[PDB]
Structure formats: C-alpha cells, structure tokens
Curated annotation (Swiss-Prot):
It comes from the Eukaryota. Interacts (via BRCT domains 1 and 2) with (phosphorylated) MDC1; promoting TOPBP1 recruitment to DNA damage sites during mitosis. Interacts (via BRCT domains 7 and 8) with (autophosphorylated) ATR; promoting activation of ATR. Interacts (via BRCT domains 7 and 8) with (phosphorylated) POLQ; specifically binds POLQ phosphorylated by PLK1, promoting POLQ recruitment to DNA damage sites. Interacts (via BRCT domains 1 and 2) with (phosphorylated) RAD9A. Interacts (via BRCT domain 2) with (phosphorylated) TP53BP1. Interacts (via BRCT domain 2) with (phosphorylated) HTATSF1. This is DNA topoisomerase 2-binding protein 1. Phosphorylated on serine and threonine residues in response to X-ray irradiation. Scaffold protein that acts as a key protein-protein adapter in DNA replication and DNA repair. Composed of multiple BRCT domains, which specifically recognize and bind phosphorylated proteins, bringing proteins together into functional combinations. Required for DNA replication initiation but not for the formation of pre-replicative complexes or the elongation stages. Necessary for the loading of replication factors onto chromatin, including GMNC, CDC45, DNA polymerases and components of the GINS complex. Some BRCT domains specifically recognize and bind phosphoserine/phosphothreonine marks on proteins. BRCT domains 1 and 2 bind phosphorylated MDC1 and RAD9A. BRCT domain 2 binds phosphorylated HTATSF1 and TP53BP1. BRCT domains 7 and 8 bind phosphorylated ATR, POLQ and RAD51. It comes from Homo sapiens. Disulfide bonds: none annotated. Induction: Up-regulated during the S phase of the cell cycle. Up-regulated by E2F1 and interferon. The chain holds residues 903 to 994 of 1522 of the full protein. It is found in: Nucleus; Chromosome; Cytoplasm, Cytoskeleton, Microtubule organizing center, Centrosome; Cytoplasm, Cytoskeleton, Spindle pole. Belongs to the TOPBP1 family. Residues 1-89 form the BRCT domain.
C-alpha cells in the first residue's frame, strides 16, 4: 500500500470517472472522500494554466496537493508513490 497516508477527493470536474479514480486510489491503500473536506490530502483535478475554476481555486488556497488523474493512473501502473510535482493539474498525458 504505497498510498497509505493519502485521502483523495475527485474534483467535480472529473465526476464522470469518480468511482474509477476512487477505486484506483483504494487499490493503492488510500482513502477517499466523495466531496472535499478537511481530511483530503490529494485533490484529483484536470485544468489549464491560470485556471479560474471555482473548486480548483478553493482547494489551491488551502494548500492541499492538486494532481492530475495521471498521478493515480501511473502510481497504479508502477505500484509506487510517484511524486506529486510531476503531475500538476495541467498535465494531460505523456
């Protein structure tokens, strides 16, 4: 369980795939919340440079890790806790 200290929350933006992303997180030992709260450590979000998305801005200011969906996908592929900084919300794929 590489993600044992993680609590993910899938952004509203990624609602279409929330169960998939939560399941990947749980497979790696993480917990998840269905909406954002003070227990979340990692917010899964896809956005753009200088993003004005409301939920993104809110989470950003709380200092929580904001990562691309590809952070979960690649952590699962590698069975490893990959660094968050390689997977900003502006990362769209390899």
């Amino acid at each position: 369980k590489p993600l044992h200290k993680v609590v993910v929350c899938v952004s509203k933006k990624l609602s279409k795939k929330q169960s998939e992303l939560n399941g990947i997180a749980a497979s790696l030992g993480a917990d998840y919340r269905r909406s954002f709260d003070e227990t979340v450590t990692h917010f899964i979000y896809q956005g753009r440079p200088n993003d004005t998305n409301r939920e993104y801005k809110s989470v950003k200011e709380r200092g929580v890790h904001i990562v691309s969906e590809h952070w979960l996908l690649d952590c699962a592929q590698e069975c490893k806790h990959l660094p968050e900084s390689l997977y900003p919300h502006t990362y769209n794929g390899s």
